[PDB]
């Protein structure tokens, strides 16, 4: 019961019932605003359609049709009536806003008969017929009987045979003929299924199509790419239709109370006169700045602005709105907090704080932290930009300096590799089916839409760069080439940006606004977790500290053994057969390594750094090419055979679970003795030459048993205690462990007896909990997402149900034995907002990620506290 | 406080304080028997010596010396007194009996001076001096200043220069000279440390040496090999010395109330007249059957038998005793429940039941279940034995038909591989330092001791075959050859058995006594767990059912794809690029595989069989030799290149965690469809042709997520439902999963939504919990045991603290969602007594192991219930 809600029968609170769009339509209805009345079929009904075999049940059909009767009775027309039909728009609404992804069908309820009854009742044949040519196209697209390709090929050639330039110029005749051509395209590109004439079948098929669409491969990739769970489901709103294609005094448009690209306060957006928004603003026929609407219809612009201001004040955030002007009567068909660009979100957050609309708290909890990745994206080198060959210019849809090769299909944009082969997507317009290539491209180059176009919208959503509405790009896919200015490209290199310019460019790195600093500042005042970085280089350390890192949660020591001028010593060691000989090979590294640590301790200035002992199996240091092995044998007095056999003997079946990490230090404690010396000697020295105290954090990797840790710990403590011969050295130091093995977590109360701190290496922990190597997992992981087996990538987003439990039991149990035990997470999960909230809630002390994710973790840790207190 | 207990101040109950030997000496003291009074230094004091830096503390020293004063005062002599010294025997006692491993020093408290005071007080110079030559040797051995090699080279050449054949023939002079030679060997094979003259230093050094010995590499390997934990510690008993080397009316010996080789009721054992047991019965000078003692000293044999009978009746189990006759006065210096051979343990268990001494329950809980492995050991082929070239004969120390190559060092016996390269250890006598080679050998061939010898004793302990006391084996290690009859062997092949005969032999398999059946019968009446086997072959099934298997807990389906006449279809499939093409390759296997299942269902006759879906990565089916790959390409129309590249593309870094198990069925559900058909069609048919009902158990391997299982389950159910077209088939079937991934266990309440049964694959579960591949782990695992990091092999013995928790949470959580969920363990752990008790206690329903471990699991499941109710 209650599968359907009238707008007035709702509120903004029931967003999961009514979806984003739904509770907003409801809210506004409540606000007493000019919105066409209507009803929402709940997200519940989506779950019902699905978890019930995929059939709109009796109670749903009836509950829908019921509301239809309400509407008729309401606005005195009969649903799909012959003389005066009641037309509706059907548009899907997820609990979460998904701009550029949802479905909208307008003018629903028109048949071969009602289009004439509507024409006579209205007295405007071109109108009724345009609204029919439009409804046939949308239903065939959204309910998916056939694609826009077919449809526009017809509306287009007609314009080009009939000497007409704008479909706005076709006549009541052309349009009605065209309806026939389109209804041909339908039946003729299918079974021979007559285009639903029955308004009621049209409605139900719309409803089904919308529920069905929720499991479309594209919805799934977007949902994963946006952390949206498929437990949600889409609501479907049905509203009484309002028309902007009624004539010269009608129109429609998309407006945003603040620039969604920049954050600049003031109306931003576009419109088209005598057009339906839901398809002709979001595309062709160059739309006009919503500011020009003051010129055309000052009566409406004034009523619109005030209503837009009232919506912003009401939802206390920038509103992305869709309105329609029905012959000088303005209607709002939709609001939603605009989806912004990161610089935008920051800018809007500061302004509302200064403007007194929102508090710092709301400002923090409001930025999608994951989007901060944009702010640290390479900008263009200005001098490379000065000498830049500007082949063109267009609309600055979403900010960014993007440069890369050009490809004409999302598929080939994606197959040239994601955001790694600098791919540039050159399209006319993008569509939901392009979601992956767009998202893989560095920037999008479109040939037609504007700021509210699909490409503008989606790109800004993903922080990708986009120049929309570049009318002069003559594209040829069969040849896969394009014309711009005095040039023709063929999947070659291109460059472009938000300064609108497009050129035939060295990118660098960029400034961080004061809204970034102001936000990060507020972040810091609310977050309780500390944010450390994962940096094994001082350049990275400074970069990380600059962005807010409070220390190093992981300095890997492998580079100190791999580096050319050092690898030979560990190779010497590996092929040595005598502890005294390995010790010797090892000792030679002390000066190199101690050297690396001082430079790190100097970069750090007092900030703690968690140093990690040798992690990888020895095999990684041995050469595996016989050229290189023949070089080594020579610099050792060995025969290629004995080196080749030494290497072979180190080889393992499962390198992720072999002789490595602490295991090597148990068989070769000399590695650990040598590392503790390099570390301890380094620290004491920088402590000497600077007076700044250092409390080294030594982390033994891959521990599964308390006795296994204690063993290596002993060797660490003894050497550390011995090194304190630069004075019996007052220096404190903490010996901790990487919990990256389930046993470590299971027996964390025993491991804590010997470990002063726990650093969760969730990447590897995930790998053992799940049973798969990140490396080999890609060969089946896509199928898993495709099958909805996994909604999130376990390697990017912490699996809280499984791996999350091990982390949470390690903390609780470790703290039974060591109440004051520090715990920090390490890895990709450290820079993931949801992994960070879990960690905040589970009690970790700090988080640690790459230097570029520190701002994300800083923001996420503040949202975690604010969301949790 | 209370680091020392008098014998009377103890009881059999405080066995962990007083050790096996201690509480037994106490018990007997209590029984009012003829044992030299004395005191025990607790196992606690061992823990104290250790966990306190390895120093016998003040409170220990004093508590010991105190009891020494007690003894003096007690048996009116003064400890290490000059004229009448008080001599003591120092012998270590673990909580657990470890025959052949502990330390004993006799005649302790004699110095260069007291040996004469003892000689005058005693009036027997040869006695005092023999007891000194003996004390110098034992202290140097046990307290380890130098080895028996040195010592006997002296006592021996003396006998062979002085025309004396038995050291029993040396005189008061020879012996005293010899003491000098030995005390030379000491100081002269060390620093120049004078042999402790101070009785009190002798005692303390004995005590320390015994505590210290507890961590000796050999104690550790034996402790692991016998599941003894190093948390235990050894107690050290100090008793007033009684002498069997006093003369012609004195002697000593080791007797067992029942044959420990066979179980036959009646005294078994040996003695030597005018000798100290603690070193001259357990070795050279051919000892006499303890039955001949009726001839020599009928007065003593009669008192001895009655006392032996009373000890057996008292401890209600066969007693292994050491007694000494001090000039016609008999003393008991020790009892302990004899360690028996498996056939023995069985035989003694039945007899005590029939004899009315013990109940069935006690009989079951008494057999060391792990020892049942002996009963199913290949016996000799009798006809190969008839035509056997008997190069010799000796004592049937422990039963068995052993055959193998001969090696003269434990090290080389072990390096020729354990019980896998049929190694035969040919020694004069074995020693604690030979523990690993003995244990690796198929049988032991000794040149001197008897039934109570080290080799006899240790071997029977481990169920290894042993022929002791083969006086004619002339051994030459420098040449590594040996003479027997008319032959000389050089690490060649040899064969031997408990029929005593030794020959220059095809072994087969053997009968199982009725005491085995009677025990197994009692087992069944008490055990609640069911015992299934792991068999993928019907030969194995029959063998397993024969031994008591109640079904199959794991039928692996890999052989059905590997077998020559079938591998090409899966290879075809693997190199096919089309679901329809793989399906085809797959379908060809249906007749072969369905064929394998019927034969299994027919062997099983109604017993359930858990069938496991394809487990290994596809790479295992592709050939990796280019000869074989060139063969395949040819039988496919492929170029070696395309096959070679297809194989390369399947290759993984970590094969244990790649694309395998359920993962393959998610990308290739056709594998699972084809397997369900082969299985379901097989079952229905045998159900047809037999009328015996079958309820297939389908097990999906490697599950980590409930949706992942459900996915594959769906495909399984649909095909199973479709196959029921041999009639809509009434056939029931259970879809379950192998919990072998931590996530599976962590999320077991969700996995149970779709799984009807959980089969724990603890081998792989251990591998993921611990972080190591069983394969690559051997390169560091020994070091771990050597370092006491791990006391047990995690792969043979279930780690209850870590892996055990995951099993136990999977059961508790699985049963929250599926109260009636069946749970069984699978693997090596299924046939491990301690893994089986845990499983009984954790609530598993059945256990499953190799067909040869079924009797062990049957017995272990009964001991688990009996130990648990």
Cα(A254)–Cα(A293) distance, integer angstroms? 12
Of A663, A773, A802, the CB nearest to B743: A802
**CB contact at 8 A, A157 and A178:** no
Instruction: Determine whether the interchain pair B769/A743 forms a contact, defined as Cβ–Cβ distance below 8 Å.
Output: yes
Q: Find the catalytic residue in B150, B377, B439, B454.
A: B454
Distance from CA of B703 to the nearest CA of A (A): 9
Q: How many CB atoms lie within 10 A of CB A714?
A: 14
Backbone angles phi, psi at B96, to 5 degrees: -95, 140
- Sign of the Cα pseudo-torsion (B160, B166, B171, B175, in order): positive
Q: How many CB atoms lie within 10 A of CB A799?
A: 28
Alpha helices in B214-286 (DSSP H): 217-225, 277-280
Question: Is A766 touching B (CB cutoff 8 A)?
Answer: no
Opening angle at CA A302, ends A299 and A306, nearest 5: 145
**CB contact at 8 A, A586 and A670:** yes
Distance from CA of A653 to the nearest CA of B (A): 6
Question: Chains A, B: CB contacts under 8 A, how many?
Answer: 164
Closest CA to A332 of A341, A343, A317, A321: A321
Q: By CB neighbour count within 10 A (0-12 exposed, 13-18 middle, 19+ buried), where does A564 fall?
A: exposed
Backbone angles phi, psi at A145, to 5 degrees: -105, -30
**CB contact at 8 A, B765 and B741:** yes
**CB contact at 8 A, A683 and A593:** no
What is chain B's Cα-based Rg? 32
Measured between beta carbons, the chain A residues lying within 8 angstroms of B653 are: 654-656, 773, 775-776
The CATH number for A382-504, chosen from 3.40.50.80, 3.40.50.10680, 3.40.830.10, 3.50.30.10, is 3.50.30.10
Measured between beta carbons, the chain A residues lying within 8 angstroms of B658 are: 772-773, 776-777, 779
Q: What is the dihedral of CA B20, B25, B28, B30, to 10 degrees?
A: -110
B823 catalytic residue (yes or no): no
B40 is an annotated ligand-binding site residue: no
A763 is an annotated ligand-binding site residue: yes
Helices (H) and strands (E) in chain B, counts: 36, 31
Cα(B709)–Cα(A497) distance, integer angstroms? 47
End-to-end, the C-alpha distance of chain B in Å comes to: 37
Residue of A nearest to B788 (CA): A707
Helices (H) and strands (E) in chain A, counts: 36, 31
**CB contact at 8 A, A164 and A228:** no
Using the 8-state DSSP alphabet, how is residue A287 labeled? P
Fold of B341-381+505-526: Pyruvate Phosphate di-kinase; domain 2 (1.10.189)
Cα(A277)–Cα(A323) distance, integer angstroms? 8
CA atoms within 13 A on the CB side of B494: 34
Instruction: Determine whether the interchain pair B659/A742 forms a contact, defined as Cβ–Cβ distance below 8 Å.
Output: no
- Sign of the Cα pseudo-torsion (B529, B534, B537, B539, in order): negative
**CB contact at 8 A, A87 and A107:** yes
Cβ-proximal residues to A869 (8 Å cutoff; 6+ apart), any chain: none
Residue whose tokens read 């009377």? B8
| Structural gaps in chain A: residues followed by a C–N separation over 2.5 Å | 504
Q: Which CATH architecture has domain B243-340?
A: 2-Layer Sandwich (3.30)
What does the DSSP assignment read for B137-200? HHHHHHTTSS-HHHHHHHHHHHHTTTT-SSGGG--HHHHHHHHHHHHHHHHHTSSSPPP--SHH
Closest CA to A112 of A174, A48, A181, A198: A198
3-class secondary structure, B319 = strand
**CB contact at 8 A, B811 and B836:** no
Q: Give Cα separations from A63 to A25, A93, A713, B644 (angstroms).
A: 19, 18, 69, 61
Cα(A718)–Cα(A722) distance, integer angstroms? 6
CA atoms within 13 A on the CB side of B515: 21
Cβ-proximal residues to B723 (8 Å cutoff; 6+ apart), any chain: B676, B677, B680, B681, B684, B729
Backbone angles phi, psi at A283, to 5 degrees: 175, -145
User: What angle do the packed helices B58-74 and B199-213 form, to 10 degrees?
Assistant: 120
In the stretch 708-727 of chain A, residues with CB closer than 8 A to chain B read 708, 711
Closest CA to A239 of A33, A21, A91, A60: A91
A498 is an annotated ligand-binding site residue: no
Domain coordinates in residue numbering, chain A: 1-108+198-242, 109-197, 243-340, 341-381+505-526, 382-504, 527-869
A761 is an annotated ligand-binding site residue: yes
Q: In three state form, how does the secondary structure of A376-433 look?
A: CCCCECHHHHHCCCCCEECEEEECCEEEEEEECCHHHHHCCCCCCCCEEEEECCCCHH
Question: Is A809 touching B (CB cutoff 8 A)?
Answer: no
Cα(B427)–Cα(B408) distance, integer angstroms? 6
Measured between beta carbons, the chain A residues lying within 8 angstroms of B708 are: 784, 789
State how far Cα B622 lies from the chain centre. 39
**CB contact at 8 A, B574 and B621:** yes
Picking from A660, A664, A776, A777 by the largest number of B CB atoms within 10 A of its own CB, the best residue to mutate is A776
**CB contact at 8 A, B834 and B227:** yes
Using the 8-state DSSP alphabet, how is residue A337 labeled? B
Token pair of B714 as six digits: 């769906």
In the stretch 728-757 of chain B, residues with CB closer than 8 A to chain A read 740-743, 746-747, 750
The number of residues making up chain B comes to 869
Token pair of A320 as six digits: 């992305």
The number of residues making up chain A comes to 869
Measured between beta carbons, the chain B residues lying within 8 angstroms of A652 are: 773, 775-776
Q: What is the dihedral of CA B634, B636, B638, B640, to 10 degrees?
A: -50
Q: Give Cα separations from A573 to A47, A369, A652, A700, B61 (angstroms).
A: 62, 46, 19, 20, 47
Token pair of A107 as six digits: 């003018």
Judging by DSSP bridges, how do beta strands B78-79 and A609-612 pair with one another?
unpaired
Closest CA to A705 of A666, A647, A648, A677: A666
Q: Which residues pair with A40 in a beta bridge?
A: A5, A237
Residue of B nearest to A653 (CA): B654
CATH class of B527-869: alpha beta
CATH class of A109-197: mainly alpha
Distance from CA of B531 to the nearest CA of A (A): 28
B761 is an annotated ligand-binding site residue: yes
- Sign of the Cα pseudo-torsion (A836, A838, A841, A847, in order): negative
Of B743, B767, B784, the CB nearest to A769: B743
Question: Is B658 touching A (CB cutoff 8 A)?
Answer: yes
Cα(A108)–Cα(A85) distance, integer angstroms? 10
Cα(B817)–Cα(B756) distance, integer angstroms? 11
Token pair of B188 as six digits: 């002269």
Instruction: Determine whether the interchain pair A743/B702 forms a contact, defined as Cβ–Cβ distance below 8 Å.
Output: no
Judging by DSSP bridges, how do beta strands A4-6 and A38-41 pair with one another?
antiparallel
Long-range Cβ contact pairs of B485-493 (< 8 A, separation 24 or more): B485/B390, B485/B391, B485/B392, B486/B391, B487/B391, B489/B406, B489/B426, B491/B405, B491/B406, B491/B407, B491/B408, B492/B405, B492/B406, B493/B403, B493/B404, B493/B405, B493/B406, B493/B422
**CB contact at 8 A, A288 and A294:** no
Closest CA to B610 of B694, B696, B678, B675: B696
Distance from CA of B702 to the nearest CA of A (A): 8
Cα(A692)–Cα(A857) distance, integer angstroms? 27
Cα(B308)–Cα(B322) distance, integer angstroms? 10
Element (DSSP H or E) covering residue B407: strand B401-407
Q: Find the catalytic residue in B46, B350, B823, B826.
A: B826
**CB contact at 8 A, B56 and B211:** yes
| Structural gaps in chain B: residues followed by a C–N separation over 2.5 Å | 504
3-class secondary structure, B475 = strand
Cα(A230)–Cα(B667) distance, integer angstroms? 21
A439 catalytic residue (yes or no): no
Distance from CA of B820 to the nearest CA of A (A): 24
Secondary structure E strands in B538-612: 552-556, 609-612
**CB contact at 8 A, A532 and A553:** yes
CATH class of B1-108+198-242: alpha beta
What does the DSSP assignment read for A91-118? EEEESS--TTTS-EEEEET--TTHHHHH
Cα(B190)–Cα(B153) distance, integer angstroms? 17
Cβ-proximal residues to A408 (8 Å cutoff; 6+ apart), any chain: A425, A426, A427, A475, A477, A480, A482, A491
Cα(A8)–Cα(B147) distance, integer angstroms? 99
- Sign of the Cα pseudo-torsion (A27, A28, A32, A36, in order): negative
Distance from CA of A868 to the nearest CA of B (A): 25
**CB contact at 8 A, A10 and A22:** yes
Closest CA to A472 of A482, A462, A457: A482
Alpha helices in B355-399 (DSSP H): 360-366, 382-386
Cβ-proximal residues to B725 (8 Å cutoff; 6+ apart), any chain: none
3-class secondary structure, B442 = coil
Element (DSSP H or E) covering residue B46: helix B44-50
Q: Which residues pair with A467 in a beta bridge?
A: A396, A445
Q: Give Cα separations from A497 to A404, A472, B789 (angstroms).
A: 12, 17, 60
Q: By CB neighbour count within 10 A (0-12 exposed, 13-18 middle, 19+ buried), where does A8 fall?
A: exposed
Token pair of B639 as six digits: 């170029």
Token pair of A168 as six digits: 């706005």
Cβ-proximal residues to A105 (8 Å cutoff; 6+ apart), any chain: A89, A90, A91, A135, A138, A139, A142, A143, A206
Q: Find the catalytic residue in A377, A454, A619, A840.
A: A454
Cα(A623)–Cα(B622) distance, integer angstroms? 28
Closest CA to A370 of A510, A498, A511, A225: A225
A433 is an annotated ligand-binding site residue: no
Of A664, A711, A767, the CB nearest to B787: A711
Instruction: Determine whether the interchain pair A789/B654 forms a contact, defined as Cβ–Cβ distance below 8 Å.
Output: no
Q: Which residues pair with B322 in a beta bridge?
A: B254, B334
Measured between beta carbons, the chain A residues lying within 8 angstroms of B664 are: 780
**CB contact at 8 A, B645 and B695:** no
Closest CA to A107 of A209, A234, A244, A208: A244
Cβ-proximal residues to B603 (8 Å cutoff; 6+ apart), any chain: B538, B541, B542, B545
Cα(A663)–Cα(A649) distance, integer angstroms? 16
Distance from CA of B655 to the nearest CA of A (A): 7
Instruction: Determine whether the interchain pair B657/A773 forms a contact, defined as Cβ–Cβ distance below 8 Å.
Output: yes
Token pair of B28 as six digits: 């007997």
Using the 8-state DSSP alphabet, how is residue B614 labeled? -
Cα(A239)–Cα(A21) distance, integer angstroms? 12
B764 is an annotated ligand-binding site residue: yes
Distance from CA of B852 to the nearest CA of A (A): 29
Instruction: Determine whether the interchain pair B789/A666 forms a contact, defined as Cβ–Cβ distance below 8 Å.
Output: yes
Picking from A617, A702, A743 by the largest number of B CB atoms within 10 A of its own CB, the best residue to mutate is A743
Cα(B646)–Cα(A718) distance, integer angstroms? 53
Cα(B438)–Cα(B425) distance, integer angstroms? 7
Opening angle at CA B122, ends B121 and B125, nearest 5: 110
What does the DSSP assignment read for A572-617? HHHH--SHHHHHHHHHTTHHHHHHHHHHHHHHHTT--EEEE---S-
Of B657, B664, B784, the CB nearest to A772: B657
Backbone angles phi, psi at A494, to 5 degrees: -145, 165
Token pair of A801 as six digits: 């149900």
Instruction: Determine whether the interchain pair A789/B666 forms a contact, defined as Cβ–Cβ distance below 8 Å.
Output: yes
End-to-end, the C-alpha distance of chain A in Å comes to: 37
What is chain A's Cα-based Rg? 32
Measured between beta carbons, the chain B residues lying within 8 angstroms of A653 are: 654-656, 773, 775-776
Picking from B619, B708, B773, B776 by the largest number of A CB atoms within 10 A of its own CB, the best residue to mutate is B776
């Amino acid at each position: 019961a209650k599968w359907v809600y009238k707008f007035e029968e709702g509120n903004a609170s029931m967003r999961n019932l009514l979806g984003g769009k739904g509770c907003n339509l409801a809210e506004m209805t409540i606000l007493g605003m000019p919105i066409p009345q209507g009803f929402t079929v709940t997200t519940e009904a989506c779950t019902e359609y699905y978890n019930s075999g995929k059939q709109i049940t009796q109670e749903i059909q009836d509950q829908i049709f019921e509301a239809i009767t309400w509407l008729e009775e309401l606005n005195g027309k009969k649903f799909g009536d012959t003389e005066d039909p009641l037309l509706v728009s059907v548009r899907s609404a997820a609990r979460a806003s998904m701009p550029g992804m949802m479905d909208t069908i307008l003018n629903l309820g028109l048949n071969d008969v009602a289009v004439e009854g509507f024409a006579k009742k209205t007295g405007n044949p071109r109108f009724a017929y345009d609204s029919y040519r439009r409804f046939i196209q949308m239903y065939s697209d959204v309910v998916m009987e056939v694609p826009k390709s077919h449809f526009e090929k017809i509306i287009d050639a007609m314009k080009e045979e009939k000497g007409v330039h704008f479909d706005t110029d076709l006549t009541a005749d052309d349009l009605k003929e065209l309806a026939e051509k389109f209804k041909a395209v339908y039946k003729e590109a299918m079974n021979g299924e007559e285009f639903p004439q029955e308004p009621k079948d049209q409605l139900m098929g719309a409803v089904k199509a919308v529920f069905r669409s929720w499991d479309n491969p594209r919805a799934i990739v977007y949902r994963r790419m946006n952390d949206i769970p498929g437990d949600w489901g889409t609501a479907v709103n049905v509203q009484t239709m309002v028309f902007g294609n009624k004539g010269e005094t009608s129109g429609t448009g998309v407006a945003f109370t603040r620039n969604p690209s920049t954050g600049e306060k003031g109306i931003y957006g576009e419109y088209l006169i005598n057009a339906q928004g839901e398809d002709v603003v979001a595309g062709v026929r160059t739309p006009q700045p919503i500011t020009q609407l003051e010129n055309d219809m000052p009566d409406c612009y004034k009523q619109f602005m005030d209503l837009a201001m009232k919506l912003e004040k009401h939802f206390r955030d920038m509103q992305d709105m869709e309105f329609t002007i029905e012959e000088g009567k303005l209607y709002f068909l939709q609001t939603r907090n605009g989806k912004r660009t990161a610089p935008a979100a920051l800018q809007i957050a500061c302004d509302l704080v200064d403007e007194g609309m929102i508090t710092e708290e709301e400002a923090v909890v409001r930025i999608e932290a994951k989007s901060l990745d944009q702010l640290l994206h390479p900008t263009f080198n200005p001098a490379a930009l000065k000498a830049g060959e500007v082949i063109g210019s267009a609309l600055p849809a979403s900010p960014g300096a993007a440069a890369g090769k050009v490809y004409f299909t999302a598929d080939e944009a994606k197959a040239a590799h994601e955001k790694g082969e600098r791919v540039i997507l050159v399209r006319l317009e993008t569509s939901p089916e392009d979601i992956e290539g767009m998202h893989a491209a560095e920037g999008i180059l479109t040939v037609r839409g504007g700021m509210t176009s699909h490409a503008a919208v989606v790109a800004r959503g993903m922080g990708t760069c986009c120049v929309s509405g570049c009318g002069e790009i003559k594209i040829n896919e069969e040849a896969k080439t394009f014309e711009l200015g005095g040039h023709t490209f063929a999947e070659g290199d291109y460059i472009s940006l938000d300064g609108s310019t497009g050129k035939i460019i060295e990118t660098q790195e960029a400034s961080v606004s004061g809204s970034f600093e102001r936000i990060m500042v507020w972040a810091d005042k609310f977050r309780t977790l500390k944010v450390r970085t994962n940096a094994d280089t001082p350049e990275d350390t400074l970069n990380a500290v600059k962005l807010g890192a409070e220390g190093i949660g992981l300095c890997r020591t492998e580079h100190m053994f791999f580096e050319a001028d050092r690898i030979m010593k560990i190779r010497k060691m590996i092929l040595s057969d005598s502890v005294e000989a390995r010790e010797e090979a090892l000792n030679e590294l002390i000066p190199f390594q101690k050297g690396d640590f001082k430079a790190m301790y100097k970069a750090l200035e007092g900030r703690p750094m968690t140093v990690r002992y040798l992690d990888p199996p020895l095999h990684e240091f041995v050469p595996h090419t016989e050229e290189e092995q023949a070089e080594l044998a020579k610099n050792m007095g060995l025969t290629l055979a004995e080196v080749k056999a030494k290497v072979d003997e180190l080889h393992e079946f499962n390198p992720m679970m072999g002789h490595r990490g602490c295991r090597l230090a148990v068989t070769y404690p000399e590695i650990a003795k040598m590392q503790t010396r390099a570390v301890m000697e380094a620290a004491i020295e920088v402590k000497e030459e600077t007076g700044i105290d250092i409390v080294p954090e030594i982390m033994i990797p891959l521990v599964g048993e308390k006795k296994e840790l204690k063993f290596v710990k002993d060797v660490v403590v003894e050497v550390a205690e011995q090194v304190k011969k630069e004075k019996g050295s007052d220096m404190q130091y903490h010996i901790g462990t990487m919990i990256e093995i389930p046993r470590a977590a299971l027996t964390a109360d025993a491991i804590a007896e010997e470990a002063e701190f726990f650093s969760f290496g969730t990447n590897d922990l995930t790998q053992m909990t799940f049973g798969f190597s990140r490396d080999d997992a890609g060969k089946f992981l896509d199928s898993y997402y495709k099958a909805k087996i996994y909604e999130s990538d376990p390697f990017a987003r912490l699996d809280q149900t499984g791996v999350g439990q091990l982390v949470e039991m390690a903390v609780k149990k470790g703290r039974q034995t060591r109440p004051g035990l520090k715990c920090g997470i390490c890895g990709e999960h450290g820079g993931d907002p949801s992994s960070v909230e879990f960690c905040h809630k589970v009690g970790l002390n700090y988080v640690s990620c790459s230097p570029f994710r520190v701002p994300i973790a800083r923001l996420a840790a503040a949202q975690a506290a604010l969301n949790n207190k």
